[PDB]
Design a protein around this nucleic acid. Structure first.
Ligand SMILES: C[C@H](N)C(=O)NS(=O)(=O)OC[C@H]1O[C@@H](n2cnc3c(N)ncnc32)[C@H](O)[C@@H]1O
Ligand SMILES: C[C@H](N)C(=O)NS(=O)(=O)OC[C@H]1O[C@@H](n2cnc3c(N)ncnc32)[C@H](O)[C@@H]1O
Ligand SMILES: [Zn+2]
Ligand SMILES: [Zn+2]
Lengths: 904, 905
RNA sequence: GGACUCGUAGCUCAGCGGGAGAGCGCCGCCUUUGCGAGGCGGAGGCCGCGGGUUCAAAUCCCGCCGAGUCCACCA
């Protein structure tokens, strides 16, 4: 917490004219070089002053400021570094880059690995979605921003510089930028994040935290000597300089514009206004006067949300002279504009550095920013697509990205399809639930977006439409991002049985061809046999495991599976059990190990191919080879066409044909990252100061395991099945070598045994199959017509076989048929104005049917017929249906008809 | 003319020989005496040595060779071990007919030096040309070993000529037992294999034991001299040809009745003991009857006619046996001798890799199996052909490249393949006896020709069914030879318009680099020629090395690439740079590589097929079309699916082993001695130096582009396996990106078919069978329903039919297709209805007339066919046809009435 | 290498331009005293695949596929 030394160990502040004092309400001590005046810099006590009168000696641009800051610290002794990707590929804890120091943790910060240079300087772009809700409302917060920084890594006894010389330099740069030493305030505070924390002081000028100098010394650990934000941090041996400068906030104070958005990307802001439904004009002088007051005091109203927000809103509106209900004709719509302008910029870096939208993982955070951005464009009714804004952001910044704008658009265009589609099914669920619930808690909105893909802002309108009362908390959206910001530990069942053995050697790194080894054993517990010097290949992924037997003088021992725990090897044995301390020699099954090598080599080739064919946005989620199968999972927005499938398999095997060398050797992480890039961690992140580098062609990956010497040892890659497991990811199924031939052979056998039962040539199978099929449809459609015609004719043959009575053809026959026939017949007889009835000797009781196209009632007829043959039924005027217990002869059929037909 | 060369022999004159003219055959010869022979006497001589061995001691097959072989080996000759009986090294002949044929024609034309000089070898030879004699003459064989010794002489220096040749011969004769005066030397012209020359037939004991040729002639289209139809020219290269009948040498030493009884007595004994033969070999009669029959055998061969019965009576009465009885021993023996000899020939054919076929080289082997089987039937042999062949492998004691287990499986196939054919054939003949009720030659020639049924069988069956027969014995080969046609006569290649000397291509030692740097030499039409190149001319559909040919001015391109000997051809469709400015050229990389992959993979598959199946498989053909390829090998039956599978397995095992593929120019003599005759599966390349290619293990003479290693060829996939002809099998395949695209193409056809029936690609067949079964049912149910429609329709019209003499007639225009009309009428006819029906169609109206009574319907069709101008016909009950003018019921009934009026009284 | 013949019910095949049939085999009922046959009845067909001719194709022509045979420096 508080240690007197760090506060007074500074030989610069105190000895260059700096004093500090604490105010009652804030309670925090701030170093001011102006003893005459006292300010603070936090929301409850400060307002921005520099608007109109730029504190700096000159307005600067965002790209001219990078160099001015970077070139400055370049000639002080610091080395220059290039920006890291906004996605955390190098670490396992988080998805996105939180800080500039987040680039170096936990490997350089825990001293395990060296730094690229010491000291270093950088303009690292970060995405902080914790401050998401505060974006647009305060005018000083951004989702994506370049955090200028300059670090210095110091180990027990050595350092380039410490807090004194730099704050000095920090103060100097400002003095070289047109800022007098007294206008600067250093508010003392702690700063945490990424597992590393430490005491700091935040540089405040014009009432704006433009910089932040963190002096971190504590590493996160369950011991938790200190307690910070509920997290447990603990002191480490080495200490490190961690500084953070906001490029975004520096240009703002140079140009002296209302908000940070008008300072950085004015083109976008001005463009959004002109092509959205916002009423007011931004050029008009009347509006400009409003904006000046609206922006100069925006710092506090951002942290305020409720009726207390109106307590400041009411006060701020009157000074201008215009009502509170009219001020919100600008401040409320501008928020929607400022946010969309900023969020779009964040879309650039997210998608530009290889993020693919999904329902989970790092793709969720990508999707989230697009989803919300799409919503804001419907509240502004923008005539532009979201891509059109990105187009400006790219050219305004002048950055070069791994993922091209061609890829960016196809994603943004596919998402609006999915967004608008996932909305239609949602509203009915919303409008139904708001009537049962009648209220909306914090959890209801979070449940809405994650489960049903419905934005928060959309839910509030439908809530207001139907009377429900809704409670939107502060950081409502930041809660969404944070809850999906943790890269899950992918924790699987771990067994660490105490063997009291902390040592273990591995032998298959140098040469995978070496299939047999020689060493002593100490294995004692379980079914597992632990050997000090073993060349077996264990894995917790179920498979990719070597297999073999062991013979000594006592007998033979067979090992089916091989596992690993705490860096120590395990060998399962079913059969006899070896004696501890035996000089043994192990043998690997040649085929199984050879197969992994052939297959594993193929996997690294395929990943290269997918990247080369589709785009640079391809990264890998998982990999597993089943018995006679194998799979690879990559990031992609849509299911690949069969045109692309062919291109993939072509390229992968074109690499085989080249037979390129497959080198493996250990490299230093910093030396490795510098040489290739963060593509090196596609299959995971290996620890240690030195890692194992694998190269299969132009593909370079940290893949400790078995491989071939050349790409031609693989054989051929044939994709078996391609499907989409989830939005954003697609699963491939492939096989090479022996499994390639078998797969291909099986496809022949199907093609051969299918074309041979149609007596056609396999090359003509597609065209001949449709021919057989189209005929099968037509001849089926034909059959039901012939059956109709049989009834069409059987009717015509019964009108002739009918005697006439009162100018009406009455027919009465006994025919052999089923019930439907009698109905399908009588309906056609009554369509030709005929009257009478029919009977069928069906199994059981005699089925009867009557009919009449004339005015005579059919059911009435059946009643009379019924009491002669003992039975009854029902029906309508045109046809009738029934069943009796005895058949009736034709002559006795006629007289009943003639009797019935006469009376009416 | 020819006398000048026979008379030059100083040896004959110097060593007491003399040239006489025998007054019987009108030909000259030599003899070492005037008066000891007191012969020859009219017309020719018989055997004398039967009962009287000419040699000092009886020899054997093995004993004879080593004596003969050592004889020349110690006298300076070079011993080269025998060639296979199959013509592998030659494209002209099918099997080795003479010992000299092992060196024709490249060695015999001076292009290549002989293995050594001089030479000597007991070489196996097959002559199915002279079979008809074999079995009767008692001196002929289908297969025999021809011991020889050859000298090869160039202009200026020789090893030895005709004088020394005869001298070396007489010595071997005299050192063996026969006196110099018993030996006779007859002058006969000789030709064969493309090389001809004057010759001396050596006759001792009344038998031709040796023959030697002095090749001064070789075949040419413009030859001045003429022998056996073909033309020969004078050689500037003279070769000494000799040939000693090993089997005949052994025979004379044993003094046995027949050569058959000397070479393989055991084989002959096995047959006779288990046959239906009417006698016992041990009796005095048969020993005596045969001993004299064998003496007069040599005449009954070269002279066949009606006087054979007179000579038969001569030997019969001289041995005093009834003429029918002599046949009772002679005729069954001939079959036994032939079969015993045939089986011996069989052995070497399969053993050296001849796979029985219905055509080509393989048919030679089949034919021999056929004849062997026919004889076994007449003898009612209790053993299979394999048993007899098995003996020869032991008796002759030779080692073959082809295993004997393979041989039996080939015999069991060919035996069953015959018994299947004769059954199919016999049943056909019977069916003629009930249809033709007679047999004639036009049939009989066709029965044998296109069904393999021997002339005798048909007559035998016809007599078992008592059918008229005639057997044209001498009209057998005429119609088989009568009708012909050939399109072109000239040489294979288009002769070039202009010539330029000494071309060369460096791409042999450099397939790895495409581009070159050379200069222009000459230009002609669309094609051009340069100094040196890396372009490899295509043979067949593909194998083309395609490339863009730039200049100092502009860029040009080559479409196809061909070759003229001594000049590379580059086919272009466009402009042409003149000789003035020399140019450079480029080659397409992707196109080149695909062929190099196919080339190497072609060798690889052949290597696989041998290992998987057997040594009996040889490449009989190979070529490729882009995205495809083919390779033909000799195998008796289309492989089982497992065999094809493992072949594909083994092939892909070899692509991963990554065996280096070396390649180097070698001379002929050293090339074939080190490897084996597998070298000439690719072809027979003319020239002194030969480009050989070592692909992993297998080595061939390939002048085509190749790969550095078997890893560059990529995956190999057999596309299709069809049996071209029984005994020859073709394999279709592809490797590299061509294999990728072919499997991808194969995958599409399956995927596509499934997306038509909306099913899993795995269930496609079992779902198709379902649809097919239903399709057959629904097609069948429509037939039943349609019959009811007609059955119902027929009754409808009978009710409203006009009555004409108690005959109800119907004439209406109905709405139904052609098949309904026809089905309708045949129902109306069955119920005695008369008239016609019509229906609107497609630029036509179908008309059907019908009659259940005496009136003829096909006549009615024309009577209504005059009215509306429509043709057609059919049976008497119904008639089908079309018309261009529809007729109203009245118009029709006006005709029906008119027709009916014609045919009553 | 050059030709010839044949693809039709499970099998052997006839029909060879206008109704797809016979023999044997298969399912059933009838007669028998002559155990196995006889009598009567029925199911079982892309008439090899694909184009051309004709009003009409199992049928005539062309091509492919498959099953066969002879001849042969003639081919
Ligand atoms: C240096 C330390 N690792 C750190 O990250 N400090 S910080 O969290 O305060 O951020 C560093 C600098 O970036 C800027 N910054 C921080 N959060 C920001 C946000 N949500 N939007 C825009 N800029 C921000 C501030 O100017 C700040 O001084
Ligand atoms: C070698 C010479 N070019 C040549 O062909 N000579 S020849 O045709 O006359 O036959 C060579 C020798 O082999 C033997 N021979 C030839 N034809 C034979 C046959 N059909 N059966 C057995 N022996 C034969 C004869 O003894 C003959 O002298
Ligand atoms: Zn891997
Ligand atoms: Zn070759």
């Amino acid at each position: 917490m508080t240690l007197d030394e760090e506060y007074l160990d500074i030989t610069f502040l105190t000895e260059n004219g700096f004093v500090r004092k604490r105010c009652p309400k804030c309670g925090k001590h701030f170093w001011t070089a102006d003893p005459e005046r006292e300010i603070c810099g936090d929301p409850p006590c400060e307002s921005y002053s520099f608007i109109g009168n730029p504190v700096f000696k000159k307005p600067f641009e965002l790209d001219e400021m990078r160099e001015y800051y970077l070139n400055f610290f370049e000639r002080r002794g610091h080395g220059r570094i290039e920006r890291y990707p906004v996605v955390a590929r190098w670490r396992t804890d988080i998805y996105l880059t939180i800080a500039s120091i987040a680039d170096f943790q936990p490997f350089v910060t825990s001293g395990v690995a060296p730094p690229p240079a010491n000291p270093l300087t950088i303009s690292q772009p970060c995405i902080r979605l914790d401050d998401l809700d505060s974006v647009g409302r305060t005018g000083r917060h951004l989702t994506l921003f370049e955090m200028m920084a300059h670090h210095a890594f110091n180990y027990p006894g050595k350092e380039i510089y410490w807090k004194n010389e730099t704050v000095a330099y920090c103060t100097e740069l400002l003095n070289e930028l047109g800022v007098k030493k007294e206008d600067i305030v250093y508010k003392e505070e702690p700063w945490a994040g990424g597992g590393n924390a430490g005491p700091c002081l935040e540089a405040i000028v014009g009432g704006l935290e433009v910089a932040t100098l963190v002096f971190m010394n504590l590493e996160e650990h369950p011991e938790g000597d200190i307690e910070i934000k509920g997290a447990r941090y603990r002191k480490m041996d080495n200490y490190i300089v961690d500084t953070g400068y906001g490029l975004e906030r520096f240009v703002w104070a140079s140009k002296g514009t209302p908000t940070v958005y008008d300072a950085i990307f004015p083109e976008v802001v001005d463009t959004i206004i002109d092509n959205s439904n916002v009423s007011f004009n931004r050029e008009d002088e009347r509006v400009r006067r409003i904006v000046a007051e609206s922006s100069k005091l925006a710092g506090i109203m951002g942290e305020l949300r409720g009726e207390r927000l109106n307590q400041l809103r009411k006060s701020v509106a009157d000074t201008v002279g215009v009502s509170v209900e009219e001020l919100e004709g600008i401040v409320v719509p501008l928020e929607k504009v400022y946010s969309l302008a900023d969020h779009t910029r964040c879309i650039l870096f997210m998608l530009g550095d290889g993020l693919v939208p999904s329902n989970a993982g790092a793709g969720y955070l990508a999707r989230l920013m697009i989803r919300r951005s799409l919503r804001l464009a419907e509240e502004l009714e923008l005539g532009l697509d979201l891509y059109d804004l990105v187009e400006m952001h790219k050219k305004i910044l002048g950055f070069e990205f791994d993922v091209p704008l061609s890829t960016v658009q196809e994603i943004l265009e596919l998402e609006k399809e999915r967004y608008r589609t996932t909305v239609s099914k949602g509203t009915r669920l919303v409008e139904r639930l708001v009537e049962r619930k009648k209220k909306l808690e914090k959890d209801d909105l979070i449940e809405l977006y994650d489960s049903h893909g419905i934005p928060v802002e959309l839910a509030v309108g439908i809530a207001a439409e139907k009377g429900a009362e809704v409670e939107m908390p502060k950081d409502i959206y930041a809660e969404l991002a944070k809850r999906h910001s943790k890269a899950e530990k992918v924790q699987e069942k771990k067994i660490t049985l105490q063997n009291e053995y902390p040592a273990t050697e591995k032998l298959y790194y140098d040469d995978p061809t070496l299939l047999e080894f020689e060493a002593e054993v100490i294995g004692v517990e379980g079914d597992f046999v632990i050997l000090n010097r073993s060349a077996f290949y264990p894995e917790s992924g179920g498979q990719d495991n070597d297999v073999g037997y062991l013979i000594a003088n006592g007998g033979k021992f067979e090992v089916v599976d091989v596992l690993e725990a705490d860096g120590v090897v395990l060998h399962v044995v079913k059969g006899a059990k070896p004696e501890v301390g035996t000089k043994v020699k192990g043998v690997i099954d040649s085929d199984v190990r050879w197969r992994h090598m052939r297959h594993h080599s193929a996997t690294h080739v395929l990943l290269y191919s997918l990247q080369k064919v589709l785009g640079n946005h391809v990264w890998q989620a998982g990999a597993r080879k089943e018995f006679s199968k194998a799979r690879l999972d990559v990031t992609h927005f849509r299911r690949p066409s069969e045109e692309e499938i062919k291109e993939i398999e072509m390229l992968a095997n074109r690499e085989i044909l080249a037979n390129k060398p497959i080198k493996w050797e250990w490299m230093d992480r910093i030396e490795a990252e510098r040489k290739f890039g963060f593509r090196l961690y596609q299959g995971g992140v290996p620890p240690g100061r030195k890692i194992r580098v694998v190269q299969v062609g132009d593909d370079v990956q940290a893949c400790g395991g078995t491989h071939c010497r050349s790409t031609g040892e693989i054989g051929m890659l044939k994709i078996l099945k391609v499907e989409s497991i989830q939005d954003g990811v697609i699963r491939f199924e492939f096989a090479a070598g022996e499994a390639a031939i078998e797969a291909v052979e099986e496809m022949e056998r199907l093609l051969r045994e299918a074309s041979s039962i149609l007596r056609v040539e396999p090359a003509k199978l597609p065209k001949t199959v449709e021919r057989f099929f189209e005929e099968w449809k037509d001849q089926r459609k034909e059959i039901e017509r012939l059956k109709s015609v049989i009834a069409d004719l059987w009717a015509d043959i019964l009108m002739e076989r009918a005697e006439e009575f009162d100018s009406m053809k009455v027919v009465a026959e006994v025919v052999d048929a089923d019930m439907q026939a009698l109905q399908k017949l009588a309906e056609r007889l009554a369509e030709k104005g005929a009257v009478g009835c029919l009977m069928a000797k069906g199994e059981g009781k005699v089925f009867v049917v009557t009919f009449s196209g004339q005015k005579y009632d059919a059911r009435e007829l059946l009643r009379e017929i019924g009491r002669v043959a003992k039975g009854s039924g029902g029906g309508r005027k045109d046809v009738a249906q029934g069943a009796v217990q005895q058949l009736l002869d034709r002559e006795e059929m006629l007289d009943v008809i003639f009797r019935f037909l006469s009376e009416h």
